[PDB]
């Protein structure tokens, strides 16, 4: 198919979100980050592995 299948409007395939903030006690490591799902793009969270 060649119609209405690809955005061709300059969006990334892989997105790396640095944590908004991070704290690290001597027992656990906690990170918080805000991920923004574009304006029209959609993802399933089978992706988004923690690196």
């Amino acid at each position: 198919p060649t119609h209405d299948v690809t955005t061709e409007r300059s969006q990334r395939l892989q997105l790396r979100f640095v944590p908004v903030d991070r704290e690290d006690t001597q027992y656990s490591y906690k990170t918080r980050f805000q991920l923004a799902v574009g304006d029209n793009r959609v993802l399933d969270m089978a992706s988004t592995y923690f690196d």
């Binding site: 198919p1 119609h3 209405d4 299948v5």
Partner: peptide, 16 residues
Amino acid sequence: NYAALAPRQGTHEMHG
């Protein structure tokens, strides 16, 4: 019609 998106050739998994 959604045939444009379809390529042109021409969930009961729960147990323990």
